[PDB]
Swiss-Prot record:
Transmembrane segments: none annotated. It is found in: Nucleus; Chromosome. Residues 1-72 form the H15 domain. Belongs to the histone H1/H5 family. The C-terminal domain is required for high-affinity binding to chromatin. The modification N6-(beta-hydroxybutyryl)lysine is found at K15, K27, K48, K53, K69. Interacts with DFFB. Histone H1 protein binds to linker DNA between nucleosomes forming the macromolecular structure known as the chromatin fiber. Histones H1 are necessary for the condensation of nucleosome chains into higher-order structured fibers. Also acts as a regulator of individual gene transcription through chromatin remodeling, nucleosome spacing and DNA methylation. This is Histone H1.1. The modification Phosphoserine is found at S4, S67. The chain holds residues 41 to 118 of 215 of the full protein. The modification Citrulline is found at R17. The modification N6-acetyllysine is found at K38, K53.
DNA sequence: GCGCGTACGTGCGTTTAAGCGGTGCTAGAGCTGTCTACGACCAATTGAGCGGCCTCGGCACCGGATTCTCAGGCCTGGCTCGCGA
């Protein structure tokens, strides 16, 4: 499972009203068997790529350190 | 600046021993007298140490290598990014 796929799965899995933060996504990936320490840069890059592609809409914070949600709209505007 | 989680504040019923009081004791602080050992004072003597002079080598310095560390470029290895089936 690619980093972005696990990120999307965890984000759709969590039911936070305000979104899933960097710490929350790290905890989810760590619970998913992912090394959150050795691959931190990759997690951040995947998050940024998902934000840029419009897959994840950032709700709080700026950059990688904020919180993000699934965009249920861009999934059908391909 | 943000997120987490755990460790500290707040309150309540239970227990526990501090504090007050009283009493009794007797150990030791405190004062007093005797006198004896001990240190101040003072003269005489001499040798210990202070001052100057001399030397010579421990060390400061410089030249010269030898090994160490910091830094960095290049290669190998795997994992990711991405597009289609």
């Amino acid at each position: 499972p690619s980093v972005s796929e696990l990120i999307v799965q965890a984000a759709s899995s969590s039911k936070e009203r305000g979104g899933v933060s960097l710490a929350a996504l790290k905890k989810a990936l760590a619970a998913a068997g992912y090394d959150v320490e050795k691959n931190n840069s990759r997690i951040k890059l995947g998050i940024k790529s998902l934000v840029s592609k419009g897959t994840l809409v950032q709700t709080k914070g700026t950059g990688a350190s904020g919180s993000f949600k699934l965009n249920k709209k861009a999934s059908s505007v391909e």
